[PDB]
Design a protein around this ligand. Structure first.
Ligand SMILES: [Mg+2]
Ligand SMILES: [Mg+2]
Ligand SMILES: [Mg+2]
Ligand SMILES: [Mg+2]
Length: 227
């Protein structure tokens, strides 16, 4: 159990219910994860019609348990150790000079499937800013996510800044503050100030008529040799 549950290719299910400035929407995703290789392959669909925000702004919200960990650090993998009961993942995403997403998700196994279920509330967005104005490019940069223990709630925190490319060559910053807490009541592995590195590629299914996002991710864990 724990890391043993990720030994092969694991089916994934993602469900997001969103409300941004009162615009409600839903997203459903399906695909597979291979933690041994740090590989994720997912396809997301907006089931309610058109997405009212850019797909990229939802990437980080839409399963860090799939990171590839080198064998010595595996005893610091909070995310797999909390499995299969899972963890709660909460974020405040503050878009620079624009609005804020508040997210609460539960990540856990439902049988053989790793499930990420999310509620997202977005507030204070500008009607013709980069988000509601859809001025973000359909691409994604690579980011490191620095993970620190928070042994008071028996979990981890992370702070990181996502850089979204804007169609005019500027970069829309999305400041992320993240908290994860186990759902189960037992002890879990806590990290020694490590980081997760992620790389993402966004594309489109040519046969798909619905508003959608195909996503391929690498994700790997690594210790901080120095700053
Ligand atoms: Mg719906
Ligand atoms: Mg988009
Ligand atoms: Mg890309
Ligand atoms: Mg939490």
């Amino acid at each position: 159990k724990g890391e043993e549950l990720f030994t092969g290719v694991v089916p994934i299910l993602v469900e997001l219910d969103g409300d941004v400035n009162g615009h409600k929407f839903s997203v459903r995703g399906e695909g597979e994860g291979d933690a041994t290789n740090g590989k994720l392959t997912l396809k997301f669909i907006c089931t309610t019609g058109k997405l009212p925000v850019p797909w990229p702004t939802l990437v980080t919200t839409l399963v860090q348990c799939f990171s590839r960990f080198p064998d010595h650090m595996k005893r610091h993998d909070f995310f797999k150790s909390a499995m299969p009961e899972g963890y709660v993942q909460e974020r405040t995403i503050s878009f620079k000079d624009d609005g804020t997403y508040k997210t609460r998700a539960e990540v856990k196994f439902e049988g053989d499937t790793l499930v990420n279920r999310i509620e997202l509330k977005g507030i204070d967005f500008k009607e013709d800013g980069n988000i509601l104005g859809h001025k973000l490019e359909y691409n994604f940069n690579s980011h490191n996510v620095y993970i620190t223990a928070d042994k008071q709630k028996n979990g981890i925190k992370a702070n990181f800044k996502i850089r979204h490319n804007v169609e005019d060559g500027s970069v829309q910053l999305a400041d992320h503050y993240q908290q994860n807490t186990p759902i189960g009541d037992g002890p879990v592995l806590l990290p020694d100030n490590h980081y997760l590195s992620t790389q993402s590629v966004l594309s489109k299914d040519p046969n798909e008529k619905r508003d959608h996002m195909v996503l391929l991710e690498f994700v790997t864990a690594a210790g901080i040799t120095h700053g």
